[PDB]
Design a protein around this ligand. Structure first.
Ligand SMILES: [Mn+2]
Ligand SMILES: [Mn+2]
Ligand SMILES: [Mn+2]
Ligand SMILES: [Mn+2]
Lengths: 495, 495, 495
């Protein structure tokens, strides 16, 4: 299980040397009083680390040097308790690459109306303290998330925690590696992209291996390791009796063991396969992909590493109780006028986290790629609102298209449909949302997620400086059309 | 053994309907008198086709539509015999994608000083005829090659023939397809690129197949086919006797037959392999690659499809008597002050077209990629001037770096060097040319060619509208730096 | 007396994990053999530090992270001994801000013609090793200096040592701070600039203090410190006898002690004054400024902090045997047709490092700013070639104009001219060079230097990514005109 907990966020308080050493300790004590009570709230998925109050420029750059060196650091929260002049922060901000969150707050809620004096205004320079700081950010063209509100309020705490999840989701991508077993499906364009621009912009390291490398590991698996997987399969899934149905289960278990060993040996965070190139593999890898995705490993099919990396990062985001992130492909539509829906599924690989029922193992005739009927997990989709994202390469840059959707319970049964399925409504209308998905050039391979909001992906794209286009409920098609071309030039030369 | 005499070039003469029908037939007859004598000259590698003199705009667009419809047409040569207004050419030029050559010429060399009358100035309106025509090209931002001179002169004929060779080299790339057996070498950047923008800009269709697909073909080869290859090997090459050296020759022969069968079935023009992904292949492809390159198939190693496609197109260019094009890798330097050279070779694959002596088959221990000692062709390089080109992906666009070099004869013999090799001097100085190659970001995999001049690649880049940077003798390093940065923005927004 | 020696340069050797651990030790030992012999050469003004050969991406980023943290590191020298794939370097190059020098070299000069085998070719993969590396720089648009040649040759060593001096000149500016005593001269434009954009681009921290701050320190100077300065003055300079001339010497001595106390307390590297705002100061700072400039402190007059910072960095460059850097103001011309010259001087402040004769203390009536006759050093200019540079603010960016000049000996003496003076010829012609200086918008305050070449400032501007325009002998006025407009948009949008 790869779940975030080790990542820490560096809370940063600012001051200057042109102050008395007595009032600085009051700021240090108050900052401890804020960050410790912040750690008392269980909403934050990671710890906070208060660092000594900064007064000179050299201290600023010294702390930022340590922020980029420690891999356990995945973000910095900056808050000006008092007036800290910004020209001290220039050299420090010109070196850091960790995401920034600008917390605008004052520790005391109300104003002591009868006791506000000049010795208190000198301490609580909150209003005009970071306004000068935000100028230096807007000036340096630096990407950051701004959040305003009193730290005791819940709304600001939710915003800063969502930013924490995103600020570490990019880190599980700068460190990790994406593995390709076979190249892209031939003549497919949306799955292709510039592998170097991903390392330069997103940080996603990406490499390709021949599938025979996997075929070496799938056969060299011990026999008493697949039975410990079969007892787990029985405790959670499994089809009737010992027939040819269980032969595919043992084959999928042997592939699962090979994949876990391989991805562990090469520090992987996501992987992708191809269905027309898996020789010496006795069967198309199914169920094992769902087993690896159930932990956290992102996956894309047909060579699509775009979707694999997006699914991995967006799975690092949605990691808590309302979890549910899967690799999706919009498969078919339901064109009734009043209740037009869309049924999403794949040929085999759908993550069992968005499942509503008991994940049921099934095997069915599947001639795609020409092997033996592979196993798969079957379940109905989850209810409620969700998001459907897709990153696609635009030649000179990447763009992230995201559609907010409302998933609905399945009304009718499907006896002959072998793969797990979800039904949802694209907001606002199927016609508008789908014609906007087509205008933006969104790929067919998407990242379905019920655990996160559009706020998450918006902070992801803001932190990585890539184009984002959202398809909210207030979607006006013509204004979205203008938005596409106005964005096309901003991200082209500037970034 | 695919050659290029089938391609034809469409000669296009311009006039207008606002003229007498009598002098238009004089223009038609004069154009026939020029084009027939043009076909009589054997310097041109392809035929010319005179099409009826154009007078109206609809005729213009009709001819250009047939130019985009006929696959045998690979270029259009435009010449204004009389004043043809350009606004008729606007709709015709706004639809064609075939390369344009602007022939500026007068059918008669001298001026009839004693017989120049108004019926002759009205006929031979060449001087101010295409001056108006070139304006609509500069205006429409249309790429074309401009050539001025009398068609009887040899210099102009050399220029137009080089343009013909390039204009058919691009067609063997818009139609053909490049095949990849395995992806790129892991973590390598200069060999990687955007496969979609390559189809959009250059037209090179590109796809990837698993190496097991080739391992299927290598084993089902008939037996009486390998000895028919060994007799041809003996007629030209071959190593002593059957011990362990003749086994690898038959292994390479069955690989050659498998590659021929595969590449012919999928309309291929170039192919690329990888040394760390050759599962079920008993031996690294060597001699067979050189055998295919000797005919015309372009090749790149370690997944480099950039070099493979460039080698294929530049082999289509250099196709006649002074032939000599190979896939090269700058392997090692010779740093003596007065006679500093560079030794280029590969691990196995060097085309036997640049060979000077008899290609000698040799087998030597080669542990790269972990297979059985493969066979290879050994020979010394050719003398005289040559060029060394490389196309590389710059994120938003491709750029073509080309170095003019002077090859020198090999002074000493190399008993322990197993691969064929070439020695050359980069113009003007090794320091200047190599530091400019590094500034421009040229790949290590290059396309060495002795059959063509820099004019060829310059018309290639002019016709495809990609950045080209030359390393001529007139190389001033600081101006080259400024050239790189000034070019980065013209090809950035405009194209 | 602040010079350089503490700065260290990190030599960086590249390889990959996909190699045998035995042949990696050969590279480590060979790199030690190169860097130790490099430290044996006294041409290099700073030390070299070999760091373990890098094989994985994480080691790359670890080294670059520590390079930005250690303040003693002022540059990184990169050299690919073997083929190191570039995608490993992406995360490492995307974090460092230290200047890069790309050393292209092979440890052995000639080629072992009779002993070149695959076990030697696998070791010295230098030729095609860093070509792949330079591609990742061209791709990431990262600024760097490329140097090609064998490390035993002296010319390449001269290039790399000049880059070392420049790479540490920028560090004494990212850390240091510039002090202003009074603002700019009123209504003057060329001295003005954006104090924030200087910290963002050049790193120069800049702040202003009232002149009364200096007037407090000038009066509380101990008495037995100024006579201890007068004895040294006698050892080097001094005017006849104790009269009104020595009163100004004691005034300059107390000003010098006050400046020494002030600038050291606030980590200063340059300072600037103004002549129309010196309240409570009994005398305009003269001789004391020359005494501080003789050590290393940069200085600009009339509030010009551009010239002060430029003089400081350009003094850090020219610090060894051929020393000689001063603050200059193009003061008057000599308009004879064949020998048109320009006489450069100021009202008081000319550095005694460019002096040819014995610096003679003199006092003369000077009504500028309304104080008491200040002291000054008088001497004739130096011979040989020199450069005259000037950085100027262009609204959105800075540009660096530099004029190559040839200094000439003074033919006649000037009895009534009170300030030290230099005579030189602007290359190629005074008309061309001065009309190009006016076209480029060069300020009247310049940085005259005899210790450095144009190569130094060209690497300064290349490392800081600012526009540079040179006025060498190869000055073509029309080409310079086009160069200005082509640079304006490249440095306007891109950087
Ligand atoms: Mn699919
Ligand atoms: Mn290679
Ligand atoms: Mn691209
Ligand atoms: Mn002045």
């Amino acid at each position: 299980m790869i779940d975030l907990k080790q990542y820490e966020f560096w809370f940063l308080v600012g001051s200057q040397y042109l102050y008395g050493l007595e009032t600085l300790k009051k700021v240090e004590q108050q900052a401890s009083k804020i960050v410790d009570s912040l750690n008392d709230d269980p909403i934050f998925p990671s710890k906070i680390v208060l660092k000594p109050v900064l007064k000179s420029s050299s201290e600023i750059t010294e702390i930022f040097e340590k922020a980029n060196a420690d891999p356990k650091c995945a973000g910095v929260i900056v808050w000006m308790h008092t007036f800290s002049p910004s020209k001290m922060w220039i050299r420090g901000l010109s070196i850091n690459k960790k995401p920034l969150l600008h917390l605008h707050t004052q520790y005391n809620r109300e104003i002591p109306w009868d006791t506000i004096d000049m010795d208190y205004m000198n301490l609580n320079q909150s209003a005009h303290g970071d306004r000068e700081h935000g100028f230096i950010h807007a000036r340096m063209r630096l990407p950051r998330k701004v959040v305003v509100g009193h730290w005791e309020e819940k709304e600001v705490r939710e915003k800063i925690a969502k930013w924490m999840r995103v600020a570490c989701a990019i880190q599980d991508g700068r460190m990790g590696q994406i593995v390709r077993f076979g190249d892209n499906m031939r003549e497919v364009a949306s799955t292709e992209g510039d592998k170097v621009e991903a390392q330069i912009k997103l940080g996603w390291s990406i490499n390709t291996w021949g599938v025979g490398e996997l075929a070496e590991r799938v056969k060299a698996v011990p026999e008493r390791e697949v039975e410990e997987l079969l007892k787990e399969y029985r405790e959670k899934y499994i089809m009737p009796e010992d027939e040819y149905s269980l032969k595919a289960i043992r084959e999928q278990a042997k592939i699962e063991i090979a994949l876990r060993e391989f991805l562990a040996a090469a520090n992987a965070v996501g992987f992708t396969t191809t269905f027309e190139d898996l020789h010496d593999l006795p069967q198309l890898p199914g169920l094992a992909v769902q087993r690896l995705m159930e932990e956290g490993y992102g996956f894309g099919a047909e060579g699509d590493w775009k979707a694999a990396g997006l699914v991995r990062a967006i799975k690092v985001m949605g990691t808590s109780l309302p979890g549910g992130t899967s690799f999706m492909e919009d498969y078919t539509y339901h064109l009734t006028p009043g209740n037009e829906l869309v049924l999403g599924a794949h040929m085999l690989e759908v993550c069992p986290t968005i499942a509503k029922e008991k994940p049921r193992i099934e095997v069915h005739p599947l001639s795609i790629g020409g092997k033996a009927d592979p196993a798969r997990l079957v379940f109905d989709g989850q209810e409620g609102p969700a998001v459907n994202a897709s990153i696609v390469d635009m030649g000179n840059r990447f763009r992230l298209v995201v559609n907010k959707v409302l998933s609905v319970p399945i009304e009718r049964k499907m006896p002959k449909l072998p793969t797990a399925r979800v039904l949802w409504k694209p907001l606002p209308d199927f016609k508008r949302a789908t014609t906007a998905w087509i205008l933006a050039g969104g790929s067919h391979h998407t990242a379905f997620s019920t655990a996160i909001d559009v706020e998450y992906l918006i902070d992801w794209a803001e932190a990585l400086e890539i184009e984002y286009v959202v398809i909210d409920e207030n979607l006006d098609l013509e204004d979205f059309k203008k938005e596409l071309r106005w964005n096309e030039l901003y991200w082209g030369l500037l970034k």
